[PDB]
Amino acid sequence: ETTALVCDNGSGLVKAGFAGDDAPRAVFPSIVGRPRHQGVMVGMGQKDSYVGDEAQSKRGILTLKYPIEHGIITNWDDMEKIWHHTFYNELRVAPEEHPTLLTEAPLNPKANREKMTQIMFETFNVPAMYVAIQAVLSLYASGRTTGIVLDSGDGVTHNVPIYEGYALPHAIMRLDLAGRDLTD
Amino acid sequence: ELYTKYARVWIPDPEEVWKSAELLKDYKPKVLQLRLEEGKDLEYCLDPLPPLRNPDILVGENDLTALSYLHEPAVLHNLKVRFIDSKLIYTYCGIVLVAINPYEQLPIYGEDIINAYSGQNMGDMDPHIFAVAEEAYKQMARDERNQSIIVSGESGAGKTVSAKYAMRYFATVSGSAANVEEKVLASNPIMESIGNAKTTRNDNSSRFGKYIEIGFDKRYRIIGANMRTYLLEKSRVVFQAEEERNYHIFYQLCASAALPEFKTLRLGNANYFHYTKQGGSPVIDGIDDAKEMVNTRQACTLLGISDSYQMGIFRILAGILHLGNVEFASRDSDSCAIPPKHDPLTIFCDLMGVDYEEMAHWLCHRKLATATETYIKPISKLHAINARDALAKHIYANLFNWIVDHVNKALHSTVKQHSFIGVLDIYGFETFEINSFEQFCINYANEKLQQQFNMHVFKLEQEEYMKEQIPWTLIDFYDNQPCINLIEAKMGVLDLLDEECKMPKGSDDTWAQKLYNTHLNKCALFEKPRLSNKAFIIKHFADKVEYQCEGFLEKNKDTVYEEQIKVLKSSKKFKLLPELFQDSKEHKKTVGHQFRNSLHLLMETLNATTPHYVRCIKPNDFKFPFTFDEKRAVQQLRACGVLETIRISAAGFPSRWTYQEFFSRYRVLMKQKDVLSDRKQTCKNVLEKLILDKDKYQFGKTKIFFRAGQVAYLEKIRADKLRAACIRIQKTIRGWLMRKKYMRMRR
Ligand SMILES: [Mg+2]
């Protein structure tokens, strides 16, 4: 079979790899750097902007933007660069070949999924796509069917109660405390 | 209708599956008057007909397709008569050869008979295993394409004797000196010791497919065999149902615990170990495991496995046994520990030459690693037991593949193999009182093989029809692909089992619920047992079989935690254990997915080849020479697919007659006006009068083709004409003779 990609955009980190692996092939910060100084040398091989481990390496020269904050994608031209880097450079796989699975915090704006979908079909030309609630996946990971899950990354924190695989939407709590506000 | 006076009929009977009867008064469109052998009338009733019987000339013929009525009691009668009264143990059905195991030695295997078959064509002779071997041996020479003989049945039926003689035939007609026969025969005790089991219903059942490739050079001198094995039932190593055993080698080893060299193995009795006590049946009556051991070691030494490797093998099997006793204590719902100074693990580490603290750590934990970072995570007592038993199944499967590679090294020859003839020995279709994942796998393999057989027969029939210039559209093709798609395809019964192995808190109950949800009303072949929610029924090729869901999931599961392999590979005490694991998803694959792949390797081996088929049947459960229990034999014939094969053949034109022999037989019905000089036109005329529906026969270039039943019809109407003529003549002679006695009395 063609295995599907799993790409947990999260915030602050991108976690990506193939379905059925036990840990991701790709873990790099979801960060885009642009150079702010005047470049002085000539013939240097200057490059417009850097994604991920590059922007981390050269960070002293750069301005670093996170395109996702509080689990909302706020700049699509950055984000599409991050996906492009994920598929082509880091996984080294053409996404037109096989499906992709994406993860999102609950209760965030409705248009975020529509834009993610539109970009995945139009530009990346993925054959099929799905988006899945992160806190549901944390139960699949911890081997349970009944849980309440405190899932807290960069950007967003939320609680989702799940009983025997029935989610209880009225009880879903979302909170905007996160690693970035502990950092600030 | 032609249920007439003195029509014979078969009637079903509890004690012998069918009894002969004779229809005592004509049928006319509710109840039949039947004369029985036991009593002159006992009466039989017809429901909202009895199977009619073939005429006496046809019964006893060399080929069951020569019969005009094709059905269970006529087949059973022909095999019974040929076996009991003529002591012919070999019979033909279509392409298949049926071998009825006599439990007695016979002169028929002599070298003069080997010469008598050499160079013949297939139909020229009464059937014999040498005639299949010869057909293969000629086709291998006539064409590049390779050949297989496939032998199917229960293991008791004597497939090994068939393969033995097929090799003796190949050796003799090749004129070869070489020495393959002795080595292949001397391999059997080890392959039976490792690969062979005692089931609920048979002792020394074989639980894998063994393929012996007899290699030939460009001149058809023999070159020495390559052995392959497929379909090994790995799950038996760790689980047994009531009064089963696992592979005999464990009981042979435990029986040998007194021998001096096995002192250090610290063995117990065979019920001391968790991987052998579960069946509750340590002793087979009539076998000394303690002595089969010695025959195994002799077979090893004849294949030249050194004494060092033999003690390595038995050291590893004592390893597996002591491993199985290791008993985890749950610390917590999400953690476990091995108790302090646990004795089975101590003896296992002493055997395998590993640090106790590393094995004790890695059995209870597993390692995750991303490229940047790695985490050591504890695992539940359930997962710890599944891991231990997956490691034991992996050590066993590797040891098996290693012993088979040393067999191959002893059997190979340096000459470049130009071509080969394969002998595949495999189990038949299997069905028990209690029915389980082992049988589900066996029945899936037998579905695949029966599909291949139907492919082959259909192809050779399209060839024969184009030989006889008959339109192909008349032969219908019967296809079991809707049943294979029920099992192997996506959302199939295997796919939902692998999907249940990894869904959280999966269980045999919720697997069964997924089965019902997916298939219950959607498929013609899947059914639910009326009174249960924990079983399902597959309408297999040979029969409906009810499988019970309890404990598939625990049998289905393999995952070997790679760090346990990486501990064992580090051993430095003895040579064999590092040797075993020389060459991942392979560790991740479940048992069912491994089996599915091994079966794909088997089918892609046989599809490269031209099949020839044998069937072995066991006539009686008690090994009486030349006795034939109808109740057993019917079951064996169903299990071998012979009956559904015959049912498929009866749909076609089974009965094929040469124009001149037809004319010889039926000139009695033919007016001396009407026989022409032209036989083909003569027969076309006669038959088109005698049987008004033209759909019952076809006029091939060389043969008449009849549907099932019509040759019996022609024989009946011939007999009726001959009887009316005889009555008229003989009554006239009676009246003449008594008229002369009147003239004597007047004188
Ligand atoms: Mg996250």
Swiss-Prot record, chain A:
Organism: Oryctolagus cuniculus (Rabbit)
Included range, full protein: 6 to 189 of 377
Subcellular location(s) of the protein: Cytoplasm, Cytoskeleton
Task of the protein: Actins are highly conserved proteins that are involved in various types of cell motility and are ubiquitously expressed in all eukaryotic cells.
Subunit structure: Polymerization of globular actin (G-actin) leads to a structural filament (F-actin) in the form of a two-stranded helix. Each actin can bind to 4 others. Interacts with alpha-actinin. Identified in a complex composed of ACTA1, COBL, GSN and TMSB4X. Interacts with TTID. Interacts (via its C-terminus) with USP25.
Gene coding for it: ACTA1
Annotated family: Belongs to the actin family.
Superkingdom field: Eukaryota
Positions of post-translational ADP-ribosylarginine modification: R174
Miscellaneous comment text of the record: In vertebrates 3 main groups of actin isoforms, alpha, beta and gamma have been identified. The alpha actins are found in muscle tissues and are a major constituent of the contractile apparatus. The beta and gamma actins coexist in most cell types as components of the cytoskeleton and as mediators of internal cell motility.
Modified positions (Tele-methylhistidine) in chain numbering: H70
Modification N6-malonyllysine, positions: K58
Protein's UniProt name: Actin, alpha skeletal muscle
Curated annotation (Swiss-Prot), chain B:
Tissue and organ distribution: Neuronal and non-neuronal cells of the brain.
Domain Myosin N-terminal SH3-like span(s) in chain numbering: 4-50
Organism superkingdom: Eukaryota
IQ domain residues: 722-744
Family: Belongs to the TRAFAC class myosin-kinesin ATPase superfamily. Myosin family.
Assembly and oligomerization: May be a homodimer, which associates with multiple calmodulin or myosin light chains.
Name of the protein in question: Unconventional myosin-Va
Protein's organism: Gallus gallus (Chicken)
The organism's taxonomic lineage, starting at the top: Eukaryota, Metazoa, Chordata, Craniata, Vertebrata
